[PDB]
From a paper:
Ung (family 1 of the UDG superfamily) is the most prevalent form of UDG and removes uracil bases, regardless of their state of base pairing or sequence context, via the cleavage of the glycosyl bond attaching them to the deoxyribose. Ung inhibitors (which are interchangeably referred to herein as UngIns) are DNA mimetic proteins utilising charge-based alignment with the Ung DNA binding cleft to dock Ung. Docking promotes the hydrophobic sequestration of the sidechain of the apical residue in the Ung DNA minor groove binding loop, which is essentially irreversible under biological conditions, to inhibit Ung. UngIn protein structures described to date fall into one of three observed folds: Ugi/SAUGI (note that Ugi and SAUGI share the same protein fold at ~12% sequence residue identity), p56, and Vpr; yet, within each fold, type there is pronounced sequence plasticity, to the extent that the unambiguous identification of an Ung inhibitor in any genome is rarely straightforward.
The weakest homolog is encoded by Bacillus phage vB_BpuM-BpSp (locus_tag = “Bp8pS_259”; accession number ALN97938) and 32% of its identity is composed of Ugi (as encoded by Bacillus phages AR9, PBS1 and PBS2). This sequence (referred to henceforth as Ugi-2) was biochemically and biochemically/structurally validated to act as an UngIn. Ugi and Ugi-2 variants show structural conservation (RMSD = 1.343 Å) despite low sequence identity (32%). Ugi-2 has 21 acidic residues in its primary sequence, while PBS1 Ugi has 18 acidic residues. There are only eight positions of conserved negatively charged residues between the two Ugi sequence variants, of which, five are within the Ung-binding β-strand 1 and α-helix 2 in a 12aa span. A PROSITE pattern of E-X(6)-[ED]-[ED]-X-[ED]-[ED] may thus be defined for these Ugi variants. The Ung-sequestering hydrophobic pocket of PBS1 Ugi is formed by eight residues, of which, only four are identical in Ugi-2. This provides important data on tolerated variations, including the essential residues that perform Ung inhibition. Sequence diversity is not limited to the loops and other flexible secondary structures.
Numbering used by the authors:
A (entry chain A): 1 to 215
B (entry chain B): 3 to 88
């Protein structure tokens, strides 16, 4: 099964014309992140059939030289945002390795769908493109991954992400849920979460190769 | 209103250059479990790490107005309030 077929079925079932017109006009008249050419990068680097793990984010980073179409990732030569710092701290405490780059393209290639629920945002405006239609799309993606794949790990950080358990068949799929790695929430249960070993233990339990979380 | 406004607001209250890197939406239950108070409405937590190693968090209301609500610095076991509406 290919993204092409899944995107086709999703775009039959819902009219995205109004969204594509709006987004056309937005890129014309505003700074919109990430660059047009990266909106779907999470899909390009992680074909449907290579999905081992789904990590949900909210909306892309809204500062320059930050978002590139992956959840949590930023550009290689960009400041490490706090949530990533805490992801990297736990990863060192959990797996052992210390990541020197804040780019998560290697994760995506390993089989981690780094899917933001909302795939665009206006500069400096958190949630600016919430409910222009991106959640309709993303929800169908999450539903598709659950319906057609056999045994996938969904990692759900914070309650907004955890609302998507509705779309997951929790009898087929592994659910790793915890408080957000944001510095507001991290010390109240994200440290010692061990989402990375837990994911790999589950993948080996169903005959899938571990994800190499390190570089 | 946008991140410039929140950067200026938070820069005034700390008297050094603040640039917020990320904005994460939290539910009221989530704000409660972390700071002790349960708001009536979703908050967005705009966060940054500074050169001196300090972690600054501005909680605001939702889009479109991102009205401040609390400003916090991270301590060993908890937080330090640097601004509050209450």
């Amino acid at each position: 099964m290919e993204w092409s077929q899944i995107f086709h079925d999703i775009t039959t079932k819902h009219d995205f014309k109004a969204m594509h017109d709006f987004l056309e006009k937005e890129y014309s008249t505003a700074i919109v992140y990430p660059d047009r050419e990266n909106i779907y990068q999470a899909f390009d680097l992680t074909p449907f059939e290579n999905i081992k793990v789904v990590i949900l984010g909210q909306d892309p980073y809204h500062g320059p030289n930050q978002a590139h179409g992956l959840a949590f990732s930023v550009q290689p030569n960009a400041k490490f945002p706090p949530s990533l710092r805490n992801m990297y701290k736990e990863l060192a405490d959990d797996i052992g390795c210390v990541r020197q780059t804040p780019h998560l393209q290697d994760w995506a290639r390993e089989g981690v769908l780094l899917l933001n629920t909302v795939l665009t945002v206006r500069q400096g405006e958190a949630n600016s493109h919430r409910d222009i239609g991106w959640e309709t799309f993303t929800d169908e993606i999450i539903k598709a991954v659950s319906d057609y794949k056999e045994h996938v790990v969904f990692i759900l950080w914070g309650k907004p992400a955890q609302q998507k358990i509705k779309l997951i068949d929790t009898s087929k799929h592994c659910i790793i849920k915890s408080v957000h790695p944001s510095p507001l929430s991290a010390y109240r249960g994200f440290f010692g979460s061990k989402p990375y070993s837990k994911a790999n233990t589950y993948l080996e339990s169903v005959g899938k190769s571990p994800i190499n979380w390190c570089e | 209103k946008n991140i410039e406004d929140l950067n200026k607001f938070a820069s005034k209250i700390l008297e050094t250059e603040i640039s917020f890197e990320e904005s994460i939406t939290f539910t009221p239950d989530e704000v409660e479990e972390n700071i002790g108070e349960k708001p009536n409405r979703d908050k967005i937590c705009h966060s940054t790490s500074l050169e001196d190693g300090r972690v600054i968090m501005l909680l605001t209301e939702l889009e479109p107005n991102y009205t401040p609500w609390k400003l916090l610095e991270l301590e060993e076991d908890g937080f330090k309030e640097l601004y509050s509406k209450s």
